[PDB]
Write an enzyme that holds these catalytic residues in place. Sequence first.
Site, PDB file in Angstrom:
ATOM      1  N   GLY A 174      55.041  38.935  44.672  1.00 52.06           N
ATOM      2  CA  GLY A 174      53.734  38.763  45.224  1.00 52.06           C
ATOM      3  C   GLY A 174      53.175  40.101  45.667  1.00 52.06           C
TER       4      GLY A 174
ATOM      5  N   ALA B 180      54.164  47.315  42.837  1.00 52.32           N
ATOM      6  CA  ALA B 180      54.070  46.705  44.136  1.00 52.32           C
ATOM      7  C   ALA B 180      55.356  46.741  44.943  1.00 52.32           C
ATOM      8  CB  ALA B 180      53.570  45.252  44.013  1.00 52.32           C
TER       9      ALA B 180
ATOM     10  N   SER C 166      45.812  45.468  41.301  1.00 53.82           N
ATOM     11  CA  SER C 166      46.653  46.584  41.037  1.00 53.82           C
ATOM     12  C   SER C 166      48.106  46.125  40.881  1.00 53.82           C
ATOM     13  CB  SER C 166      46.545  47.551  42.244  1.00 53.82           C
ATOM     14  OG  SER C 166      47.395  48.664  42.037  1.00 53.82           O
ATOM     15  N   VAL C 167      48.854  46.856  40.073  1.00 49.81           N
ATOM     16  CA  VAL C 167      50.285  46.625  39.885  1.00 49.81           C
ATOM     17  C   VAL C 167      51.079  47.844  40.398  1.00 49.81           C
ATOM     18  CG1 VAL C 167      50.081  45.099  37.955  1.00 49.81           C
ATOM     19  CG2 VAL C 167      50.149  47.544  37.464  1.00 49.81           C
TER      20      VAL C 167
ATOM     21  N   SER D  28      42.419  52.931  40.409  1.00 45.83           N
ATOM     22  CA  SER D  28      43.504  52.152  39.892  1.00 45.83           C
ATOM     23  C   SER D  28      43.092  51.789  38.467  1.00 45.83           C
ATOM     24  CB  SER D  28      43.736  50.876  40.708  1.00 45.83           C
ATOM     25  OG  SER D  28      44.544  49.906  40.041  1.00 45.83           O
ATOM     26  N   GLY D  29      43.799  52.350  37.504  1.00 49.14           N
ATOM     27  CA  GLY D  29      43.546  52.051  36.090  1.00 49.14           C
ATOM     28  C   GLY D  29      44.036  50.682  35.650  1.00 49.14           C
TER      29      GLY D  29
ATOM     30  N   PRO E 296      55.790  40.610  49.645  1.00 48.61           N
ATOM     31  CA  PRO E 296      57.060  40.076  49.207  1.00 48.61           C
ATOM     32  C   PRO E 296      57.281  40.150  47.714  1.00 48.61           C
ATOM     33  CG  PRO E 296      55.513  38.280  49.554  1.00 48.61           C
ATOM     34  CD  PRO E 296      54.855  39.521  50.037  1.00 48.61           C
TER      35      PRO E 296
ATOM     36  N   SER F 130      48.875  53.748  44.935  1.00 47.93           N
ATOM     37  CA  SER F 130      48.745  54.247  43.591  1.00 47.93           C
ATOM     38  C   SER F 130      49.215  55.672  43.516  1.00 47.93           C
ATOM     39  CB  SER F 130      47.270  54.141  43.233  1.00 47.93           C
ATOM     40  OG  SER F 130      47.127  53.341  42.105  1.00 47.93           O
TER      41      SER F 130
ATOM     42  N   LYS G 295      48.899  41.940  35.274  1.00 47.01           N
ATOM     43  CA  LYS G 295      47.586  42.346  35.690  1.00 47.01           C
ATOM     44  C   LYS G 295      46.495  41.423  35.147  1.00 47.01           C
ATOM     45  CE  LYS G 295      46.497  46.449  36.777  1.00 47.01           C
ATOM     46  NZ  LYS G 295      46.769  47.855  36.412  1.00 47.01           N
TER      47      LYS G 295
ATOM     48  N   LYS H   2      46.998  57.350  47.494  1.00 47.78           N
ATOM     49  CA  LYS H   2      47.293  57.996  46.222  1.00 47.78           C
ATOM     50  C   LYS H   2      48.268  59.117  46.416  1.00 47.78           C
ATOM     51  CE  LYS H   2      46.478  58.329  41.789  1.00 47.78           C
ATOM     52  NZ  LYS H   2      45.285  58.032  40.973  1.00 47.78           N
TER      53      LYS H   2
HETATM   54  N1  LIG Z   1      50.644  53.910  40.597  1.00 47.06           N
HETATM   55  C1  LIG Z   1      49.573  53.490  40.037  1.00 47.06           C
HETATM   56  O1  LIG Z   1      48.560  54.146  40.195  1.00 47.06           O
HETATM   57  C2  LIG Z   1      49.647  52.273  39.073  1.00 47.06           C
HETATM   58  N2  LIG Z   1      48.408  52.293  38.260  1.00 47.06           N
HETATM   59  C3  LIG Z   1      48.481  53.326  37.194  1.00 47.06           C
HETATM   60  C4  LIG Z   1      47.147  53.762  36.709  1.00 47.06           C
HETATM   61  O2  LIG Z   1      46.277  53.663  37.564  1.00 47.06           O
HETATM   62  O3  LIG Z   1      46.972  54.254  35.544  1.00 47.06           O
HETATM   63  C5  LIG Z   1      48.123  50.879  37.766  1.00 47.06           C
HETATM   64  C6  LIG Z   1      47.434  50.140  38.861  1.00 47.06           C
HETATM   65  O4  LIG Z   1      47.120  50.759  39.905  1.00 47.06           O
HETATM   66  O5  LIG Z   1      47.238  48.893  38.683  1.00 47.06           O
HETATM   67 NA    NA Z   2      55.677  43.011  46.036  1.00 48.24          NA
END
Ligand SMILES: NC(=O)CN(CC(=O)O)CC(=O)O
Ligand code: NA
Lengths: 367, 367, 367, 367
Positions: free
Chosen positions: D356, D348, D345-346, D81-82, D353, D228, D326, D160
């Site tokens: 969150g 979501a 991670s974002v 997860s970047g 919910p 991700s 983040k 993934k």
């Molecule tokens: N879909 C994802 O992989 C979202 N990722 C993108 C990434 O890893 O570059 C951000 C994260 O995981 O917080």
């Molecule tokens: Na959510």
Amino acid sequence: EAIEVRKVPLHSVSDASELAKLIDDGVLEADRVIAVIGKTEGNGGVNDYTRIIADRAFREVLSAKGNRSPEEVAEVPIVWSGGTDGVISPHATIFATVPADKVTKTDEPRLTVGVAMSEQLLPEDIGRTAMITKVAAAVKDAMADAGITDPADVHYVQTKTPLLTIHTIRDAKSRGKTVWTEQTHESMDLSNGGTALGIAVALGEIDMPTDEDVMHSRELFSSVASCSSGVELDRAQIVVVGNARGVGGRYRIGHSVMKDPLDQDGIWAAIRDAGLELPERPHSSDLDGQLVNVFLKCEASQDGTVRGRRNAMLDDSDVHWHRQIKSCVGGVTAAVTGDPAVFVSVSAAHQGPEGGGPVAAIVDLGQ
Amino acid sequence: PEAIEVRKVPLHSVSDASELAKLIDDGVLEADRVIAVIGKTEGNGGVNDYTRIIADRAFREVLSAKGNRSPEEVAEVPIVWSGGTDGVISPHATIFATVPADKVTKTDEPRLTVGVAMSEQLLPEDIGRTAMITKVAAAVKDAMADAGITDPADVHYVQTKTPLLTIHTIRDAKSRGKTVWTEQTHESMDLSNGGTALGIAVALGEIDMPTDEDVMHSRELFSSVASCSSGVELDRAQIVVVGNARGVGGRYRIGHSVMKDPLDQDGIWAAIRDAGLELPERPHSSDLDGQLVNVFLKCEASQDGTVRGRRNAMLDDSDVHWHRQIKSCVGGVTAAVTGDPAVFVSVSAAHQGPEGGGPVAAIVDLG
Amino acid sequence: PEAIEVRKVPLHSVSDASELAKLIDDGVLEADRVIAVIGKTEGNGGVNDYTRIIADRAFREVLSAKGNRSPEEVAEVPIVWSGGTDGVISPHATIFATVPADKVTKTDEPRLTVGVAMSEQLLPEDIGRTAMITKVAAAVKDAMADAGITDPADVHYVQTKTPLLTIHTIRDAKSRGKTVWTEQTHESMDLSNGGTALGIAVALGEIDMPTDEDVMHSRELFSSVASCSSGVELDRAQIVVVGNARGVGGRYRIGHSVMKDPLDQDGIWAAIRDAGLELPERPHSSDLDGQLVNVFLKCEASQDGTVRGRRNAMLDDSDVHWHRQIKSCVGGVTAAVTGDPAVFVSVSAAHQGPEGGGPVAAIVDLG
Amino acid sequence: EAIEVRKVPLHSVSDASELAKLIDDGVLEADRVIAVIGKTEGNGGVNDYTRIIADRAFREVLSAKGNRSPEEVAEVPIVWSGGTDGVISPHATIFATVPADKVTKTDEPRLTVGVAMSEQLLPEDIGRTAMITKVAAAVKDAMADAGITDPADVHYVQTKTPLLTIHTIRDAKSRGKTVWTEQTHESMDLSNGGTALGIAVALGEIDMPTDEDVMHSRELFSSVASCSSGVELDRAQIVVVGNARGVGGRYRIGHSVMKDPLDQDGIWAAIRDAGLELPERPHSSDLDGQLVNVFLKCEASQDGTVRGRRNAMLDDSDVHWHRQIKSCVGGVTAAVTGDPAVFVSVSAAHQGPEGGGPVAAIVDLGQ
Ligand SMILES: NC(=O)CN(CC(=O)O)CC(=O)O
Ligand code: NA
Ligand SMILES: NC(=O)CN(CC(=O)O)CC(=O)O
Ligand SMILES: NC(=O)CN(CC(=O)O)CC(=O)O
Ligand SMILES: NC(=O)CN(CC(=O)O)CC(=O)O
Ligand SMILES: [Cl-]
Ligand SMILES: [Cl-]
Ligand code: NA
Ligand code: NA
Ligand code: NA
């Protein structure tokens, strides 16, 4: 009525001094200013507040130097396209009527401006046929206001229409309506695209499209539309710029298309259309003071390429391609005009062909 | 003294070296004869741009796999990746290789020659100071001799890649009781390029040996052939001197001129003409007929915040650094001349060309 | 010596001052008695953040409309807008007003007092040098006397807003044959805050008068109450000294502590406790019971690139400047303590608290 | 089989030295590593190449220090997860089996890991029921692989899955299929959302949803999903982490939910669920070395508020709210753990919910 057109630089975000100076030097009259179209130095996205600051600055000059009331001044359509990435210089193009005793009427085509406001645009209209038809009707009204019956004499239609906000979306849903999207950035591109189809419908460029066409049928476009959007009004502001015979004045407008971000030839084509006679391979040094401004759209192609070369604009999460393409085309364009004060705008759905955009040029010919 | 083959290839993805491998397989050039690579990668063009190291590993692995050179020998091949391909700029690599004399036509006409050298290690301490300048001037000396050039006037292009400052290297300097010119990592890019450029200008006799105080401050001091880029892929100055020599043969020739500002397409035309490609007056990209291999140039935002008397907001923009704005702008300016978005446009040009401009070099295929 | 009313109000939009107007209409405070405003605005928090000037004009227009003060008198009210509300941070303004003695309960308990002062003009020349330091120390002196405070230990918070360097002001310095500490406009923010902070620390006897060489370099030199922010809305140091005095009355009291690093919620708790709000050990946001008005703090990315022995990549990030990263991070840290996203979190904290941390002040409602 | 879990920092983008050191010190065996889940310092968006560099670094250590072939090593699921905005420290959580002679089996619940790969995910599947059902099937497979029959013992499912690219979109259309969207950033959020519904279907959290539900019905979510996506594979990588009785080992996993970005209590809840006995109002200093890591999602709410306070995340065109949120939640989270190495991670959708996200915690209990 004949039109005077003057492009002035903004020295800072709240500067309207060059407008004030035109008025003091008798170049134009405050109360005769009928439209302003400019570029402001904000980010050119959603949270761009430089458009508000310029508006107040210009309106305060118009109210101070004229007999118009601040209410009358507030009716003057002023459209700010944010984002001046790269060399693009903040500026405003001012359109004013000219008193009859200052003009020599001529059968030659010369510049005319028409303005109109559409019916209210509800959130559920944005991006759908209701926006398209209400815009088309106001474009016809602005066209008549300009004294133009033939759509071929329309060269540039600059608009400003609403975007979707949390609040207006909430309103739509409270009345049992839906919206095309809830994303504000997307609602901007949508609002521009729907307005652009309305322009193309009004001018007979396309047959009336369906809801399904909007943002999808990129073969459908206006060749003169330049659409922007913001939170200010709940209807469409239209400014039609074209030519009429028998009116007089110094200026004329022309247009063409830029097929892709590098299509300087298309910009030259617009300038030629506008009435300049130029060499086969023109250079900025050939313009001899005669080019007022150019107005164009640009965009990154969905195929991710320009002239068979891959670029990484579309996937760039650091700097949105809107800003990348704006700066790139700013340079391409200023290299043709020799003047970094150029009107280069992004968000170009249904405004020129895919990967390109309309380009208009206003030139100073004399009587 | 050896003839050169030059090939510009696209990168199809960040880790793609397939077009290099294909050139080798088709017998266009030999892996062990590759002496230098100069390319553009699709990263952010700043400090944390890892697209440069990915391309480096991809190319070096092809060179070590298809040749008899050891990964150690391969590692000494100067590969310069200028990150950041804002706008239309297409990721690509320009490959320079020697050619056996049996495959060339010797000629008293000037034809391309390349010299390479790696400087001594550059400590974080050295970056931006006389130590960087004297180490660079020395490696440039070496490279000039390697190209078989004694006269600096035959040098048209010196491409370097030097380290910038990172948290890690700044931590190093301080762990050894040393000091650094700045701790703003992104600032350190401009400094690294500038110090290297003064080293080039010292080596080529363009300027007298400057002082610490001159670095970044005396912009009247510059090289007219220096193209200095910086990143995080080697702690040494990778130097590539490119010029012409008579009696060597080969198909390609190099020329240069100067871009006086970001919009100076004529300066790019001048470079192409200087390179020996006979073009019409009033040239257009359609005149090139496949004969321009690439151009290589620097650009920058002027310290006075203007281009051709027009203000821009680049230097005050805390959203999108002017590096990226100017790079996109000049990418378009440049690609509009070549007709090919694969152009080598690098940013941050202290002591590299006049202030607000930069050197521009062109390599052409004359046969 | 006068009692203070403090009200934190949300901004509903960039130009919204409606909640101030409502406080005035409801008799909570009087327009002419507003002596200082400190807020957060939703702009980018960098150089080209125009949300600060929009809020300024909105608030000043309310103050001049609802009171007998002249727009000139109003203009001398120090209003400090710290731009940048990354993450959850909610745009808001903290309003400080005097209260007639007839409306307060006098008490020997310490209660809030405010002093205000505007320094002399700060030239671009002065920013970051002894001239900024001595001018600031002087205005801080003035403000302390204005608050009725002779003992520096009763000072808990000194909020300033000073100019940064812009292209325009840098152009000015050079037009008069002067020099500037840097020309990197975004760098100049850190410098402006730092020089002001040393002026505060000099005025309060926290440090001996430093040298030009100490600015930005001697991070062991700091004020424990300084909160210095910078922008483009006045070329003078707007100073607001906040402390406590006995015998004045009023409902509010101020306290402070220090955040040793970005995650130091205990330091924020300590400030609230210091302010006189009696809380359980092991406090939680649910213990506040409406009694915390706001907190005001500084944060920064440590020069060593670590927090609690863990590396982060903030200082090498050329995409999103660490100013914005750390601001969002500490916004969350802070709002998790207060339970209220309307928190005053400002970035760039040279000579303001220990390196990698910052001062934190709290104002509480004790009755 | 019993599991050893070790969180190691990455000292740089291509560093796997701490993994190598664990192996040398006998803490775990290279060939017994069955999964790696980490945070990398790239931009966390589409054009994030730091995930590729870390992958190679880790795989090279596994191949070098073990008897596994580079083909076997390549089957090891590694998920990066970047984006490590703010204080978040790049790191990798390593999951390895433990030889029987190293464990004391216990009826107490202890950590288990299951892995699986789904059937191929065609572009036309992404975001639609076909993705949902194929994911659900692979989650059931991974659950069995972990030795878990009861879904309540699943606490964290890291996946993934593929995103849509120009190329795969072209493929879909060549076979007469459509795709849910053509925007790559959107395709990521979609791919995550569809995968998350598949997880929730597999675990009996929700009934099988419709195409229409995906990205729209935010009431439908998994309470353990962490999804991700990237360009690497055309199927879903599943890693199930839960507990099983009778296996032995030191570690246990637990989870809860974060209701909003500031919900430290929800993180504490996860740690309590995982088997720590803590005070009513815990502090990081209570953990006593026992917390391995936490894994959570976060997001900006569609209503534009947190705890009744407006923020400007959603409209910010300068810094995408993904990065803002983040960094904010990184601080909130690291303030609870006291260790900036946290998995935040974002993206979501359908993962916790709205506003969150799920939060999981792995703790070290002993035998
Ligand atoms: N879909 C994802 O992989 C979202 N990722 C993108 C990434 O890893 O570059 C951000 C994260 O995981 O917080
Ligand atoms: Na959510
Ligand atoms: N819809 C728009 O107004 C797009 N705008 C947005 C803005 O003005 O901030 C960019 C442009 O016009 O180039
Ligand atoms: N250090 C630099 O010169 C920046 N580089 C970009 C890079 O890191 O590769 C050259 C350029 O884009 O101008
Ligand atoms: N100059 C500064 O101090 C930056 N400011 C932001 C601003 O311009 O208002 C304070 C902050 O956000 O930390
Ligand atoms: Cl008249
Ligand atoms: Cl075993
Ligand atoms: Na278009
Ligand atoms: Na230069
Ligand atoms: Na500090």
